[PDB]
Amino acid sequence: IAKMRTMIEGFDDISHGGLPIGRSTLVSGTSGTGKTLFSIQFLYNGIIEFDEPGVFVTFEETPQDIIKNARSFGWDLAKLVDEGKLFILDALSALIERINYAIQKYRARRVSIDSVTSVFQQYDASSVVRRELFRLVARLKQIGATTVMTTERIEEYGPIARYGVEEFVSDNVVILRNVLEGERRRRTLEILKLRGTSHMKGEYPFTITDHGINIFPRSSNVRVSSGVVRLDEMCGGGFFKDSIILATGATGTGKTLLVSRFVENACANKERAILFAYEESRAQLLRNAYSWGMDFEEMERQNLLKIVCAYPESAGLEDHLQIIKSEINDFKPARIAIDSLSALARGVSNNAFRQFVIGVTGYAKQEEITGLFTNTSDQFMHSITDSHICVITDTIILLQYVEIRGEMSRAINVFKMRGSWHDKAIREFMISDKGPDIKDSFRNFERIISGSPTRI
Amino acid sequence: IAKMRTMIEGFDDISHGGLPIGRSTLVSGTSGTGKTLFSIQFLYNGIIEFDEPGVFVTFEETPQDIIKNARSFGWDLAKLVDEGKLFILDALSALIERINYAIQKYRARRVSIDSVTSVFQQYDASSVVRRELFRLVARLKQIGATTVMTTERIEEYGPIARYGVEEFVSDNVVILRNVLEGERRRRTLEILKLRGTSHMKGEYPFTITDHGINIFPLRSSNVRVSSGVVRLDEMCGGGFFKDSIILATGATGTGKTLLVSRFVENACANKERAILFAYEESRAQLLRNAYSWGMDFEEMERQNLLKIVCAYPESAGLEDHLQIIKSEINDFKPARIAIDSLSALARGVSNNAFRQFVIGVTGYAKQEEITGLFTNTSDQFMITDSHICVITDTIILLQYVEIRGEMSRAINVFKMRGSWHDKAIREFMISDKGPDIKDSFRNFERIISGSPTRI
Amino acid sequence: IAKMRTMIEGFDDISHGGLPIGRSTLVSGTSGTGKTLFSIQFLYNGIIEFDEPGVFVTFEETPQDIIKNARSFGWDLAKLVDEGKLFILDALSALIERINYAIQKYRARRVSIDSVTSVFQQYDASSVVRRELFRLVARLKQIGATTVMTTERIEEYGPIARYGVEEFVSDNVVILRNVLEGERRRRTLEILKLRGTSHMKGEYPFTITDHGINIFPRSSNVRVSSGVVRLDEMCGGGFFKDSIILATGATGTGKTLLVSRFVENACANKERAILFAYEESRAQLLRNAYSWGMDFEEMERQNLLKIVCAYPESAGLEDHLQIIKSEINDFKPARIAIDSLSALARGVSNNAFRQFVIGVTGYAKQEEITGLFTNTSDQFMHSITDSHICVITDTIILLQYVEIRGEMSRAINVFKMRGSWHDKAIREFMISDKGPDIKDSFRNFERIISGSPTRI
Ligand SMILES: Nc1ncnc2c1ncn2[C@@H]1O[C@H](COP(=O)(O)OP(=O)(O)OP(=O)(O)O)[C@@H](O)[C@H]1O
Ligand SMILES: Nc1ncnc2c1ncn2[C@@H]1O[C@H](COP(=O)(O)OP(=O)(O)OP(=O)(O)O)[C@@H](O)[C@H]1O
Ligand SMILES: Nc1ncnc2c1ncn2[C@@H]1O[C@H](COP(=O)(O)OP(=O)(O)OP(=O)(O)O)[C@@H](O)[C@H]1O
Ligand SMILES: Nc1ncnc2c1ncn2[C@@H]1O[C@H](COP(=O)(O)OP(=O)(O)OP(=O)(O)O)[C@@H](O)[C@H]1O
Ligand SMILES: Nc1ncnc2c1ncn2[C@@H]1O[C@H](COP(=O)(O)OP(=O)(O)OP(=O)(O)O)[C@@H](O)[C@H]1O
Ligand SMILES: Nc1ncnc2c1ncn2[C@@H]1O[C@H](COP(=O)(O)OP(=O)(O)OP(=O)(O)O)[C@@H](O)[C@H]1O
Ligand SMILES: [Mg+2]
Ligand SMILES: [Mg+2]
Ligand SMILES: [Mg+2]
Ligand SMILES: [Mg+2]
Ligand SMILES: [Mg+2]
Ligand SMILES: [Mg+2]
């Protein structure tokens, strides 16, 4: 069973090439799940790469309404119909005749029906839909044309179709969802089945952007500097180039300080860098940064630093990824920084957050980009990690508060360093008007990893 | 009631021999559960295993599509007509006649109907369905031919059939599921009932492969093997046991992958095949860190001795991961394997679904005399273990020890099943040639806390 | 209201003698709940003990199909019909006439209808079923014949009957269930009501075995040895004969060691013993046992030791009990051992597990059998007990890991000893190639029950 590519980033790897060739694919889902976006996108791409003639059988929508909406991603469907490359059939057993006729005058390639459920309200009685659905499918499989049929749905976790008898007739079943969890919508695609072929089971986080659908399913010894000399000395030549560094610690420990010095160092060696902040804003960052003797405003004047400030609850976790991606595909920084993940995990599913970290890490390492992700710990004085995904990070620079003689002092230590030597000493440090000052470690103190020390 | 082997791996143990002789079995479930697959496999295996006639009754789609769908597993229609061993009937009491025809025509034994739910569009009443259901099975039983019926379902945890009156008429009820939990689907088969016979109660994890369905049901020599480290072998009093399961738990960056790299290296060193299942790092990374310790993993794969199967834990489901391991070991056939790690496969997974995984790998690994070293990154570094350290025969736990404001690491053989081991928590270090197990801490107390005390 | 015995192990004590005499009993439940198994079992037993004439009114099942299925437990229904002791009436107001006629030619005793729901699909409309059900019941109560009526069900926790009007007509209501919790089926029986009589309320764990249905609703000073001399010295003459001993402790403490020495001691005094293992297999056990100088293979050669290895998730908790019972009813060991309960409680209901422990304990003590049950603790260094059923055990031999001068040493202490003196000292012990070596206790150490000790 040969498959037909749809040029839809994600769907090509989820269905292993695409959808069963010469067969009909049913795409069900609720309203605003992207049933039409996918439908025309299956034709557009098809009639832009392999130069294939595709006909669109519209029903409750006007042939200009479809083209007026496709202009949201800069798609000129008029120019498609101005070269006989796309035919829109405006709309009981005579409909297949016109489709069979049009497709004959437009050499059978890609066909989309939006929607079949619409022209079935006057029939109903469940058993009737199936009887008239089977005939349609069969009538298309005889002409051997990769057809996508749209179906309506009432529930996001209930009947597959309105009359629950379309999935049993259809050979291939793709379900588009828009689940709302904690007053936040999440678009997820899934391939229920695919007769005489293989596919990726379960649902994968996707979104609709200005390019349309966006479905989301080396290791050199090159070392880079973190901005701090002693830190690179503790890491035995600084952080690795293509690696993920983690800055875990309590509130006001110096995470954003290390991020600022990590981004500065990039711009210092004429290297581009992106800073994704979710806790503070450009205004505050510039002031805080300048207070340590760093010109963040100037760093952006050289087109070497970009600041993307936004709230962690502003958009969805499946969205935030796309922003980072598009932000990296444009500016093309050598290294990025996330401040912070703690803010991107608050009121989010433990699994939904795991898919995010895996995404950034993968993409960050896939493009050989150095990413310094910070994480704020709950207990300031310390268990381990909430979702404990410290196994994804190659380096772990944790900061801990140390109470010494009624003085709230801070300490830094390189907890982990994959395929690299590091200092296993909890060196004390302080903050000044020029960044960190890592001094000597606490040799005459015991139980330093348990908030409070002990005289020796 | 005579059994009938279907040659479906797992099913012949779940149904105790297979399905009842000259009885009608009902296989209900949702769409994509694998109802048609089972139906074909039942006849296919039955045809090329005991030269038995098979009659497939189609209803929804045509004989060509069904024949064109089995090509995904490598099954051809050479029995369809080129051997007259596969009779397909394209599609109330007139159907039964045609059924008895091909049956007595080719001295039939096996029969599959797919689907019967599609022949009850008009009849919107359960009364009619039951009446015309019983008559079918009753007829089929009069001919005493092992027939499999297929029905459709709306919910995975609701009515048995579409009209909920088919399981009561049917003698044997099989239910195929495709439950979706946490954006992840899991195919599970269960034998609801089986009249005048015994079977296994509850649902068993299965998958669909290119050999079709793979249902998953539910020695001890003193030969020792080297762990890669000499002191470690001395700590186990002769090295690791051959046909045994070793576990390495500890905080992130304790050196689990280090002990794995040496455990796999030692294999290839003695010209022994070993498989490495990574779910945290990738080949590129592992090769770098490995070489940094003075180990050439690339070379090890150049001699067809070491294999690396990197895959994100979240990529596939727990049931698929198992099949991937089994098939991977069925091809390469290593003398020992290593999983890095179990903790990476226990993330956003049910404790019951995870238990079934560890039991499988352990069982299968222990069933083929394969030495397995599974790692498990402990959540709270510097307590217990909310899982199963009872399954593992050996436990090599690594713990971080803070001494004089220095993040030092220690190792100890926590347990060694039916063997002597060192009961001392000796400090160790990592260099550019592997571990260096030094001496323990005699003048330090509460070393299990992660923070000792000057004695 | 006199009751009629059914000779069904469990149902006789649940309904206090049996079911209301001269009245009709409705048995509802889903498919494969054992509606037919019970139905014929009510006749078989009845026409095998009190020599009573019973007629079976079958519907959607053939008179040979019922007999062909009853042969799963070795029941010759043909021989029952070959002496006019059982009559099968193969199958609107004329059905009661034949039943009234047959029962007259087969002196009214035990009657079973399987099923009434079957011959009602052509009626439906809820109110119709009741009207035609009442007439049936009344027509049977007039002939005074203990009749059991089978009813179909869709839900395990929903309507009592298909039309939910059969329980209001029927005098007695028995509901058979097959609940699925965590991909595991559990058969439970219940008596909803019983007019003019008393019964046991709630549902009781049952199973179907080769004997059919299996519903599951002294104290001498005789002392026995545990295999260890010092252990018997710490128990002041060894464990009590008819008592339950518990071996709680962390992983690799020496639980299976004490079990092996406890089973060996039985075979040593020419006493039979059963070992129920769920963590290891015969292969490993024999090797581990032989490493301590115990010949487990030989112990089975004398027909004094039996090993029943099986996984704790292989079968159901309500099943595992039956296995132990049948295993003890055959071999008839003087003492048994369970290794372990921790494995039999993983992914099980806290209450469902409580009913198991009570079962083994009761049966173990009911047959005056000594049972050494082991339990693995979670924290290796220790709170108390998960489901804390240490109140069921008469003796508690807990083992605890003790870290001494960077050496992971082990310790044993007799925590409890009901109606017996015991040693209240945490004696240290080690393992060798001949079993345990209990030495002196830790006198110069403090906080030994909190993992880590303290110099004194
Ligand atoms: N240019 C755009 N940029 C971002 N999101 C867009 C853009 N255009 C549309 N969308 C999003 O995608 C949706 C359009 O999806 P589409 O029209 O295919 O829905 P549908 O599922 O076919 O709806 P219906 O059930 O009414 O037919 C919009 O509602 C909006 O959420
Ligand atoms: N080669 C293959 N590799 C992997 N999975 C496959 C392969 N071939 C088929 N499958 C899987 O098995 C499914 C086929 O099952 P099958 O065609 O029997 O469905 P079904 O349950 O009979 O559906 P229906 O409700 O339409 O009768 C596909 O949807 C896919 O999930
Ligand atoms: N100009 C300055 N001089 C001295 N110390 C400073 C100065 N500016 C900031 N600090 C110190 O360093 C800390 C700043 O660290 P930073 O702002 O990076 O916090 P953080 O660890 O990222 O915390 P969070 O993100 O939770 O607010 C302040 O709490 C203060 O102790
Ligand atoms: N010999 C046996 N050993 C063990 N279990 C058996 C044996 N025979 C039958 N069983 C079990 O008991 C069931 C038989 O129960 P029975 O036929 O009474 O069901 P039922 O509830 O009457 O079904 P229906 O609703 O279809 O009439 C089988 O499905 C199986 O689970
Ligand atoms: N070349 C090297 N030289 C010195 N020490 C090294 C070297 N490579 C690794 N290490 C040490 O070993 C640690 C990594 O060991 P390893 O990756 O096996 O640990 P792990 O517990 O499996 O980690 P993770 O939780 O990330 O899987 C580093 O943190 C460092 O302390
Ligand atoms: N031949 C031997 N010589 C010395 N010590 C041994 C020998 N065999 C086993 N041991 C020791 O005794 C322990 C065995 O105890 P046992 O196997 O009964 O463990 P357990 O407490 O039942 O643990 P679990 O059931 O959780 O695996 C081993 O961990 C080891 O310390
Ligand atoms: Mg639309
Ligand atoms: Mg900050
Ligand atoms: Mg099918
Ligand atoms: Mg690792
Ligand atoms: Mg029955
Ligand atoms: Mg044990």
Asked if B201 and C288 come within 8 Å (Cβ–Cβ), the reply is no
Q: How far is the CA of A236 from the centre of ligand 5 (A)?
A: 14
Give the whole-angstrom CA distance, residue B321 versus residue B318: 5
Name the nearest CA neighbour of C37 among A281, B193, B256.
B193
Shortest alpha-carbon distance between residue C422 and chain B (Å): 29
Which ligand 1 atom minimizes the distance to the CA of A152? 25
Shortest alpha-carbon distance between residue A258 and chain B (Å): 21
Name the nearest CA neighbour of B66 among B106, B28, B114.
B114
Contacts (Cβ under 8 Å, ≥6 apart) of A83: none
Name the nearest CA neighbour of A311 among A354, A337, A343, A289.
A343
| B363 and B322 Cβ atoms separated by less than 8 Å | no
Q: Which residues pair with C188 in a beta bridge?
A: C177, C205
| A392 and B280 Cβ atoms separated by less than 8 Å | yes
Residues of B in contact with A390 (CB under 8 A): 252
Task: Give the H/E segment covering residue C413.
Answer: strand C408-417
Method: X-ray
Contacts (Cβ under 8 Å, ≥6 apart) of C268: none
Residues of C in contact with B159 (CB under 8 A): 154
All chains having 3 or more CB pairs closer than 8 angstroms to chain B: A, C
The one catalytic residue among B52, B280, B319, B427: B280
**Does B contact A via 3+ CB–CB distances below 8 Å?**
yes
Helix (H, G, I), strand (E, B) or coil at C86: strand
The one catalytic residue among C49, C60, C97, C298: C60
Report how many Cβ contacts below 8 Å link chain A to chain B. 154
Residues of A in contact with B280 (CB under 8 A): 391-392
Helix (H, G, I), strand (E, B) or coil at C4: strand
Give the whole-angstrom CA distance, residue B354 versus residue B363: 14
Q: How far is the CA of B38 from the centre of ligand 9 (A)?
A: 9
How far, in Å, are A362, A391, B129, B300 from residue B291 at the CA level?
23, 20, 69, 12
Asked if A456 and B453 come within 8 Å (Cβ–Cβ), the reply is no
* % helix, strand, coil for chain B, step of 5: 30, 25, 45
Which ligand 2 atom minimizes the distance to the CA of A193? 29
B433 labeled part of a ligand binding site: no
Q: Rounded to 5 degrees, what are φ and ψ at C397?
A: -100, 85
Asked if B61 and A171 come within 8 Å (Cβ–Cβ), the reply is yes
Eight-class DSSP state of C441: B
Of B131, B390, B424, the CB nearest to C407: B424
Quick one: residue A441, left, alpha or beta (phi over 0 = left, psi -120 to 50 = alpha)?
Answer: beta
Q: What is the dihedral of CA B101, B103, B104, B106, to 10 degrees?
A: 110
| C372 and C337 Cβ atoms separated by less than 8 Å | yes
Asked if C184 and B198 come within 8 Å (Cβ–Cβ), the reply is no
Give the whole-angstrom CA distance, residue A39 versus residue A48: 15
Residues of B in contact with C346 (CB under 8 A): 351, 355, 388
How far, in Å, are A430, B83, B365, B376 from residue A238 at the CA level?
20, 71, 42, 29
How far, in Å, are A241, A420, C133 from residue A237 at the CA level?
11, 9, 88
Alpha helices in B277-317 (DSSP H): 283-292, 297-302
Helix (H, G, I), strand (E, B) or coil at B67: helix
Terminal CA-to-CA distance of chain C, rounded, Å?
74
How far, in Å, are B241, B263, B297, B336 from residue B268 at the CA level?
17, 9, 10, 10
| B248 and B398 Cβ atoms separated by less than 8 Å | yes
**Does A contact C via 3+ CB–CB distances below 8 Å?**
no
Which sign does the torsion angle of CA C91, C57, C66, C204 carry? positive
Beta strands in C49-129 (DSSP E): 54-58, 86-88, 110-114
Shortest alpha-carbon distance between residue B4 and chain A (Å): 27
Q: Which residues line ligand 4 (CB under 6 A)?
A: B 168, 193-199; C 31-37, 72-73, 208, 210
Give the whole-angstrom CA distance, residue A397 versus residue A412: 7
Tokens representing residue A328 in the block:
């990296």
* CB atoms near residue B147 (< 10 Å): 26
Tokens representing residue C217 in the block:
């609703």
Indicate the burial class of A58 (C-beta count within 10 angstroms; 0-12, 13-18, 19 or more): buried
Indicate the burial class of B76 (C-beta count within 10 angstroms; 0-12, 13-18, 19 or more): exposed
Indicate if ligand 3 lies below 6 Å from the C-beta of A261. no
Q: How far is the CA of A448 from the centre of ligand 3 (A)?
A: 21
Terminal CA-to-CA distance of chain B, rounded, Å?
74
Helix (H, G, I), strand (E, B) or coil at C332: coil
Q: Which residues line ligand 1 (CB under 6 A)?
A: A 31-37, 72-73, 208, 210
Indicate the burial class of C111 (C-beta count within 10 angstroms; 0-12, 13-18, 19 or more): buried
Asked if C118 and B168 come within 8 Å (Cβ–Cβ), the reply is yes
Asked if B344 and A391 come within 8 Å (Cβ–Cβ), the reply is yes
Per DSSP bridges, beta strands A305-307 and C203-209 are unpaired
Asked if B31 and A168 come within 8 Å (Cβ–Cβ), the reply is yes
State the best of C408, C446, C456 to mutate against chain B, taking most chain B CBs within 10 Å.
C408
Per residue, the 3-state secondary structure of C170-235, as one string, reads: CCEEEEEEEEECCCCEEEEEEEEEECCCCCCCCEEEEEEECCEEEECCCCCCCEECCCCHHHHHHC
Q: Which residues pair with B209 in a beta bridge?
A: B212
How far, in Å, are B75, B87, B100, B280 from residue B106 at the CA level?
21, 9, 10, 56
Eight-class DSSP state of B118: G
Residue whose CA is at the smallest distance from ligand 6 atom 25: B390
Give the whole-angstrom CA distance, residue B197 versus residue A84: 66
Terminal CA-to-CA distance of chain A, rounded, Å?
74
Tokens representing residue C360 in the block:
């083994």
Q: Rounded to 5 degrees, what are φ and ψ at B96?
A: -55, -40
**Treating both helix axes as pointing N-terminal to C-terminal, what angle do B318-332 and B351-367 enclose, rounded to 10 degrees?**
10
Contacts (Cβ under 8 Å, ≥6 apart) of B211: B73
Q: What is the resolution of this structure in A?
A: 2.9
Give the whole-angstrom CA distance, residue B409 versus residue C60: 72
Give the whole-angstrom CA distance, residue C453 versus residue C445: 6
Name the nearest CA neighbour of A89 among A143, A53, A135, A130.
A53
| A143 and A100 Cβ atoms separated by less than 8 Å | yes
| C423 and C233 Cβ atoms separated by less than 8 Å | yes
Task: Give the H/E segment covering residue C131.
Answer: helix C127-141
Which ligand 5 atom minimizes the distance to the CA of A424? 31
Q: Rounded to 5 degrees, what are φ and ψ at B66?
A: -55, -45
Shortest alpha-carbon distance between residue B105 and chain A (Å): 30
Which amino acid is present at C358? Answer: I
Give the whole-angstrom CA distance, residue C111 versus residue C54: 5
